[PDB]
Amino acid sequence: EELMPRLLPVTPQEYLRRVQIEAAQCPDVVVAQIDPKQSVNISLSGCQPAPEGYSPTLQWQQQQVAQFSTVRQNVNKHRSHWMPKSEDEEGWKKFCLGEIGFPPLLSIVSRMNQATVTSVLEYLSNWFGERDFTPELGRWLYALLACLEKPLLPEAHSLIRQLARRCSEVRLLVDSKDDERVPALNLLICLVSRYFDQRDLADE
């Protein structure tokens, strides 16, 4: 609006003119030259690119992105007809993944509010840092992603990105396409990167 607002009206008024007068004769922009060492700012990583042949095709990506949308429209219905505590990292891990543990029925994920969904994504991501990727883990991730309502809190964007990272890292431990994880990992990365707009993380 005003970079430098005038605070004083234009005796003192006599002085202020003298000042305004003098200043207008002062050069506007002044560059001095200098006759002839940088810190680092810690940037988090990108995704790890897929091992050759593991990178999915766009049409499959677009397909999933498109599919997922429709799936999300369904989730709202259930959440229309109307669990561990929110802070219970240990319960939530156990509840979703077990020892089995509860699948993600709409009956449950539909009940969770947005702060909880986000809470649980974090917890399931922490487990993930420290245990292996099962199919049970995968559905929950999909389910939580499907339940997240936008626009997203930045904190929620960071969390899903870390998760895509973790996925891309686990994807390098694989040694055949037939590995059960490959499709799931590719999907979660594809969702985060295309659906949730983090296009810097996308497999291309």
Binding site: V71, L106, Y142, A143, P183
Partner: peptide, 17 residues
């Protein structure tokens, strides 16, 4: 169909070709 999601995920994994 209360397991629409679980279903949704399996379909999505399975479409990988």
């Amino acid at each position: 169909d209360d397991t629409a999601l679980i279903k949704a995920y399996d379909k999505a994994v399975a479409s990988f070709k």
